């Protein structure tokens, strides 16, 4: 098709919960507009600045109103989201998914997408990689990799607290298996009855190029498969590597797609 100028600002929204094909999603996005895609690997590997603006953000978020109407407190919060989001043309993962709501009326142009998987792949892959059990020994590999990276205490809140964000619960027994099931389906049951469905795309884990790229009006990168990166396979390889390192830069050449 003809190429065209396309607008950087956030045209799609993902709602979908981490480990579910976000970060695929992440760089799909990114090859379709040439412009960068939000994500947690985001604030990880280039704004770790914004760490604390996401969590004041979720502190105040009980300020928030569902709009219409819009009230003052309201857009004093959807500022400080704008801001964030500058420069990029969609958001994936944590710690955004959970504002999928609010983000759809800052952005009334924008798209919304859902990625769902099986519910006990997403807690399998989930444990492996973003909230192992407390008596699981990975756990600590996990923080000793993430101290590798510059990352501490104010990450994991961030983490946990945009999770409890998105299920919309405080007391949230993080190593229940049942609860966490739970909270999955009601999340993803909650988002298809709030987007309107002329806004909303729900896409399976693997559906690939197909039926996004209708819907957001582009044509198929031509002779790129859709990515398939950041299984918990990899994520073991890269925590792993991380701890026998001890820097990012002396391994990055070995995650190209992933970082
Ligand atoms: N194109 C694709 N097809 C199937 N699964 C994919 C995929 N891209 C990513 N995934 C899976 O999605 C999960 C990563 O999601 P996220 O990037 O949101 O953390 C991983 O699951 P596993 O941990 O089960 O391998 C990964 O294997
Ligand atoms: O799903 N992830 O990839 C994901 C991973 C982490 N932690 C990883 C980051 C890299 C270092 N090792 C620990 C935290 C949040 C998410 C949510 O995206």
Redesign the pocket.
């Known amino acids: 098709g003809a190429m065209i100028e396309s607008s950087t600002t956030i045209q799609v929204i993902s709602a979908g919960l981490?480990?579910?094909?976000?970060?695929?999603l992440k760089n799909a996005l990114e090859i379709i507009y040439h412009k960068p895609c939000y994500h947690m690997f985001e604030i990880i590997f280039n704004k770790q600045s914004d760490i604390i603006k996401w969590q004041n953000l979720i502190h105040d978020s009980h300020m928030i109103t569902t709009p219409p109407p819009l009230t003052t407190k309201t857009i004093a919060i959807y500022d400080k989201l704008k801001e964030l989001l500058d420069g990029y043309i969609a958001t994936t993962?944590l710690p955004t998914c959970g504002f999928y709501k609010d983000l759809m009326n800052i952005y009334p142009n924008a798209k919304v997408l859902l990625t769902i998987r099986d519910k006990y792949?997403w807690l399998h892959?989930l444990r492996?990689?973003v909230l192992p059990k407390s008596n699981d020994p990975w756990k600590l590999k996990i923080e000793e990799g993430d101290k590798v990276l510059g990352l501490n205490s104010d990450f994991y809140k961030l983490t946990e607290d945009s999770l409890k964000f998105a299920f919309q619960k405080d007391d949230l027994n993080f190593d229940d298996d049942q609860v966490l099931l739970e909270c999955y389906d009601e999340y993803n049951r909650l988002v298809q009855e709030t987007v309107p469905s002329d806004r909303l795309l729900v896409l399976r884990?693997?559906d690939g190029w197909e039926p996004l790229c209708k819907f957001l009006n582009v044509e198929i990168p031509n002779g790129i498969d859709?990515?398939?990166?950041?299984?918990?396979?990899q994520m073991t390889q890269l925590t792993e590597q991380l701890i026998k390192y001890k820097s990012l830069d002396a391994i990055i050449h070995m995650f190209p797609d992933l970082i």
Do not use: A, F, I, Q
């Open positions: 981490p480990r579910t094909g976000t970060k695929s993962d792949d892959s492996k990689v884990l693997g859709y990515p398939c990166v950041n299984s918990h396979h």
